[PDB]
């Protein structure tokens, strides 16, 4: 689990969104595994606006942060689960690293700020849903 709080927005994995997230929906995209809902309180996370390919992610299944090299956002094939059929997930970045399903929502950060959140994994590869292109999160 985990979310990004910026301004009056909350960014979470769409497959983990709550009833309150859907009742205050701003935007959602199944192909990206993202959902953004509105909040009453002000968020202070900084979103990175860059093309960094190195960062640090939080892995809850190890209670540790790991430094990683990651690919540019792209369309990557993702196996079926209880939340989605087998499909291509867009805006996804992969890195060599550990993850388990409950790790979804852990933040990936670079020197400029928040890059994305853990969204997929398997075979020693972890995938992050990019949020750097969502320029509207700041206004
Ligand atoms: C960190 S997730 C993970 N990690 C290791 C093994 C397995 C997983 C689980 C996983 O990949 N997904 C299940 C939940 C939805 C995901 C999606 N975006 O389609 C796919
Ligand atoms: Zn950066």
UniProtKB/Swiss-Prot annotation:
It comes from the Viruses. The active site is at residues 15, 33, 104. Transmembrane segments: none annotated. It catalyses: Selective cleavage of Tyr-|-Gly bond in the picornavirus polyprotein. Zn(2+) 1 binds at residues 50, 52, 110, 112. Coiled coil: none annotated. Homodimer. Cysteine protease that cleaves viral polyprotein and specific host proteins. It is responsible for the autocatalytic cleavage between the P1 and P2 regions, which is the first cleavage occurring in the polyprotein. Also cleaves the host translation initiation factor EIF4G1, in order to shut down the capped cellular mRNA translation. Inhibits the host nucleus-cytoplasm protein and RNA trafficking by cleaving host members of the nuclear pores. Counteracts stress granule formation probably by antagonizing its assembly or promoting its dissassembly. This is Protease 2A. The lineage of its organism: Viruses, Riboviria, Orthornavirae, Pisuviricota, Pisoniviricetes. The chain holds residues 869 to 1007 of 2193 of the full protein.
């Amino acid at each position: 689990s985990g979310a990004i709080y910026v301004g009056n927005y909350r960014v979470v994995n769409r497959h983990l969104a709550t009833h309150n997230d859907w009742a205050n929906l701003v935007w959602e995209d199944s192909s990206r595994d993202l959902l953004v809902s509105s909040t009453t309180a002000q968020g202070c996370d900084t979103i990175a606006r860059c093309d960094c390919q190195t960062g640090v992610y939080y892995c809850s299944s190890r209670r540790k942060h790991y430094p990683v090299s990651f690919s540019k956002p792209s369309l990557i094939f993702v196996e079926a689960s209880e939340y989605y059929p087998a499909r291509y997930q867009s805006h996804l970045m992969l890195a060599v690293g550990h993850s388990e399903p409950g790790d979804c929502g852990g933040i990936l950060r670079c020197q400029h700020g928040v890059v994305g959140i853990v969204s997929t994994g398997g075979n020693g590869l972890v995938g992050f849903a990019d949020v750097r292109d969502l320029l509207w999160l700041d206004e």
